[PDB]
Every structure is written in C-alpha cells, then in structure tokens.
Design a protein around this nucleic acid. Structure first.
Ligand SMILES: Nc1nc2c(ncn2[C@H]2C[C@H](O)[C@@H](COP(=O)(O)NP(=O)(O)OP(=O)(O)O)O2)c(=O)[nH]1
Ligand SMILES: [Mg+2]
Ligand SMILES: [Mg+2]
Ligand code: NA
Ligand code: NA
Length: 325
DNA sequence: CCGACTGCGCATCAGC
DNA sequence: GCTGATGCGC
DNA sequence: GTCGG
C-alpha cells in the first residue's frame, strides 16, 4: 500500500524503535515497535484512530494512545523531545557505524565523541570492525541493485568452483527470493567432505581465493565456519561501492535446512515452523526432527534438498520467489 | 501478574 | 596463560 | 511494548 496512507505513523514507530534499541537498550521494546510498524505498514486503510489500530496484532494500549496524539497533533511530544536531545541523538547516530552498538555508542558520547569526525579523530579507540564500519559508513548504507548482485554471484560461484569443483555455494537472502535490490550478500557454502559427524581450511581456502582476485577487500570477522567482511566489483569508470558479504560453511547434512533458513523471509520462516509443529515436526536452522508422542524430539531426518523439508510437512514446494510470507 | 520475545559465531572484555 | 561473559551482527 | 499462560 501507499506510504502516504499511514507513513507518518510507521515513521513515528520506527523512530521510537531505534531509540529503544540504541539509547534505552531495550531490545524487546525495539522489536515491539517494529512489529507494530510492520503490521500497520501492511494495513490497507488510512487509520482514523488509535482504537482502529489496536485491532491489529502487535498494537497495544500505549501505541494506540500514541497514534491518537499523532493524528490529533501531527507529532509526538516525547519523540520531538528526544530528537532534540544532543546526547540521545548522538548515541542513536553512532550506532549506524557497523561494529558500534548501543554500549560502544554510549561510551563514546560519554567521553565527548559524538560524530564521524570525532571517530575519525580517535582511531586508536576503535576496534578492527569499527574502523572498517567507519571507513565504509556511506557504502554500507547503500542498497545493492540486483544486476550488481548477479555480477557478484558470478565471481563467487566461479572462484569457489576454481578452488574445488566439489564445493557447493548458494547465494541466499533476499536475492534468492528474487528481490530487485539487496542490503548485503549471504553465501552458504558446503563440501561433501564436511558433515556433522565429520579439513577446517575449507572456508579459509575460499576466502583466500576471493581475496587473491581482489573481490574480498576487508575482513570483519573470520573463524572456521563463518566469514564476515567487505567485497567490491572490479572497476575507467567510477568504482563500485564496497559491500557487505557473509560466507557460512555448513555441514552437508545440514546444508539445505541452512539454505531454507537463510533464504527467508523471517515472516515466511515463522509460518513454516508453526505449520511444521502442527504436523509433528520441529524445524530450526540446522535440522528437521519428529516430535514423539509427548514432545521428545527424535533423530534429525535426512535432508538432501529443500523440497525434502516441504515433503516431510506435507507442503508443496514454494519457490523462493513466493516466500515473503 | 509476569515471563517470553532465536540463539549462535566471532572478537574482545572481565576475571581467575 | 585459560575460561566464561559480554558486545555485536544477523 | 505486546501478548498470553
Ligand atoms: N529466529 C530468528 N531468526 C531470524 C530473526 N530475524 C532474522 N532471522 C534469520 C532469518 C533470515 O533469513 C536471516 C537474515 O538474513 P539477511 O540477509 O540479514 N536478511 P535478507 O537477506 O532477507 O534481506 P537483505 O536484503 O536486507 O539482506 O536470519 C529472528 O528474530 N528470529
Ligand atoms: Mg541479506
Ligand atoms: Mg545478511
Ligand atoms: Na492489538
Ligand atoms: Na552499529
């Protein structure tokens, strides 16, 4: 639906959400406001009253009350005030730097460090992640057009196969759902030699090759199963924005549960789990399991493709395209 | 009334 | 030194 | 902040 429907309300709720997460450090209030924001964003009518909004799941007494104030006045007194607050708005802003959370942001603002400029001045007080986040502050907040994501996929699948043709790599996330743009790139990686009961250079070798051809440019974090970092498409034209890329190495017997999980959406993943229990199965990130007569979970069932998971719960395979809910 | 709201990998801190 | 807790991102 | 046991 059009933003001009309830965009004022959803903007208000999103703004309240961020201050809860970043300033009050109340993560559950943060998700509460966002849940309320989401369901109102989907609501196909211009809301006339807080009581009207309250019918929706996720909208309670306090938000219905806040909406009443917004509709009547065009603003929120509390929001106006906190917007104004130099301390709170600075803390809120610094968290936009990847690696700087609520705790670091507060500590920085505590000692007078409030801006990117201030961060740029105080490099030795930033850890490795926070420096990278600072270095690519602008780039990290850009979205990635699908065409560039396709070019990025080309390089990943090529270099991965070059390392070992028996690797299996799948670019999941919104891109796999066929979105016209993405926030980052999520690559899931496996190899027949790696199972749950199973070299742990399997991830390193792929990262290394992607670094060698200068696709991967920076490393945020890297262990034996998970890589988080920065990549960039090759350039006399203007150079591309640096992009966030994650690579996960998953055991083969857990790969397609992994692919399903990290393809999303979260809203879709929720239903699929809920319907999975109603059929007597439990689905998490790693496995699908039967729930015995009292709720005792048996051994993880063998999964060799996505559809296998759909078959167990008697679902017909839904294409990633049709997985926004 | 009052507990749940995903929980894990990695980097780094806190403490022994 | 090591172990467990915390911060962070997702 | 919201929901529900
Ligand atoms: N249990 C649980 N799992 C979650 C939750 N939130 C997310 N997940 C899981 C399920 C999600 O699929 C995954 C996050 O993948 P991203 O790449 O960060 N999001 P995407 O790629 O779709 O969009 P973008 O284009 O912006 O990158 O984490 C949660 O609250 N609870
Ligand atoms: Mg993504
Ligand atoms: Mg991601
Ligand atoms: Na409600
Ligand atoms: Na941040």
């Amino acid at each position: 639906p059009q933003e001009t429907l309830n965009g004022g309300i959803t903007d208000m709720l999103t703004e309240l959400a961020n201050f809860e997460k970043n300033v009050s450090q109340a993560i559950h209030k943060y998700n509460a406001y966002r849940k309320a924001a989401s369901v109102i964003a989907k609501y196909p009518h211009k809301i006339k009253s807080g009581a009207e909004a309250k019918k929706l799941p996720g909208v309670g007494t306090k938000i219905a009350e806040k909406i009443d104030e917004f509709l009547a006045t065009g603003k929120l007194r509390k929001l106006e005030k906190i917007r104004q607050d130099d301390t709170s708005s600075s803390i809120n802003f610094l968290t936009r730097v990847s690696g700087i959370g609520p705790s670091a942001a507060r500590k920085f603002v505590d000692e007078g460090i409030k801006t990117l400029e201030d961060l740029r001045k105080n490099e030795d007080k930033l850890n490795h992640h926070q420096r990278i986040g600072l270095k690519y502050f602008g780039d990290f907040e850009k979205r990635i057009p699908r065409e560039e994501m396709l070019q990025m996929q080309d390089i990943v699948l090529n270099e991965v196969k070059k390392v070992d043709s028996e690797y299996i790599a799948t670019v999941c996330g919104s891109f796999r759902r066929g979105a016209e743009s993405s926030g980052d790139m999520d690559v899931l990686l496996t190899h027949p030699s790696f199972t749950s009961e199973s070299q742990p250079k399997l991830l390193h070798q792929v990262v290394e090759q992607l670094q060698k051809v200068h696709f991967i440019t920076d490393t945020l974090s890297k262990g034996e199963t998970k890589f988080m970092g920065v990549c960039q498409l090759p350039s006399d034209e203007k150079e591309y924005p640096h992009r966030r890329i994650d690579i996960r190495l998953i055991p083969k017997d857990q790969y397609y549960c992994g692919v399903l999980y990290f393809t999303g959406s979260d809203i879709f993943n929720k239903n699929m789990r809920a319907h999975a229990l109603e059929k007597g199965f439990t689905i998490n990130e790693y496995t699908i399991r039967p729930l015995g007569v009292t709720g005792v979970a048996g051994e993880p069932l063998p999964v060799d493709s996505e559809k296998d998971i759909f078959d167990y719960i008697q679902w017909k395979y839904r294409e990633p395209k049709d997985r926004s809910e």
